[PDB]
Amino acid sequence: ALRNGQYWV
Amino acid sequence: QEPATAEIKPNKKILIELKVEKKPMGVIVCGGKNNHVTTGCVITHVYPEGQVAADKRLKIFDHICDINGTPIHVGSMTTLKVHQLFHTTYEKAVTLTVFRADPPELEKFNVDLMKKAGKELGLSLSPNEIGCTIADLIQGQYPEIDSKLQRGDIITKFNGDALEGLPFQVCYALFKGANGKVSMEVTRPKPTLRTEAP
């Protein structure tokens, strides 16, 4: 996901 | 050599001077007293857009001994302090003493969990020639991650696939493409001690 400008796995 | 242009010979402490001029250094480092790496400060990722990259000299696994005045003995500095020396914006040029180990000096471990569907690992990754360096992480997702992984670790292999030199799109799709068994191979720097305490 994209959350607060970063991409998370 | 002159520090501004000195090459980095293997297995020799080199004092260098890097043009920063208020632009970010853009490195990922590890090391600290409460850290998993307690033996030195080591670069585990170089952002292509930052000043370290613009200088062209430093590589992944380079051991940083001194930054400006400060010798970086991580045994007596917090993980915070270590990281924060690299994220400060400096006005002019920064002096560093560097050691490139050849061969490199690394720890290699495994991390296994059963991921729950729609519950993220809580990891944000930066891809490079070694694998996917962990840039940041939210604690409290999986007990295994908290106790075995930190910012700066490099994930070398995910469910069988070698992560080395892969596009971010590819990496992100691999991680997001799993819900079940997770088998992660990890490379972490373990330099030998080259720093004394204050």
- Give chain A's end-to-end CA distance (angstroms, integer): 7
CA distance A4 to chain B (A): 12
Experimental method: X-ray
Hey, how many other C-beta atoms are within 10 angstroms of the C-beta on B121?
25
Are both B1-105 and B106-198 of the same fold?
yes
Instruction: Please name the fold of domain B1-105.
Output: Pdz3 Domain (2.30.42)
Interchain contact, A7 vs B176, CB within 8 Å: no
Structural contact between residues B61 and B41, judged by C-beta atoms closer than 8 angstroms: no
Structural contact between residues B13 and B65, judged by C-beta atoms closer than 8 angstroms: yes
Tell me which CATH homologous superfamily contains domain B106-198: PDZ domain (2.30.42.10)
Q: Where are the domains of chain B?
A: 1-105, 106-198
Q: For tokens 């402490």, what's the residue?
A: B13
Reduced to 3 states (helix: H, G, I; strand: E, B; else coil), residue B95 is strand
Cβ neighbourhood burial of B59 (10 Å; 0-12, 13-18, 19+) = middle
Interchain contact, B120 vs A6, CB within 8 Å: no
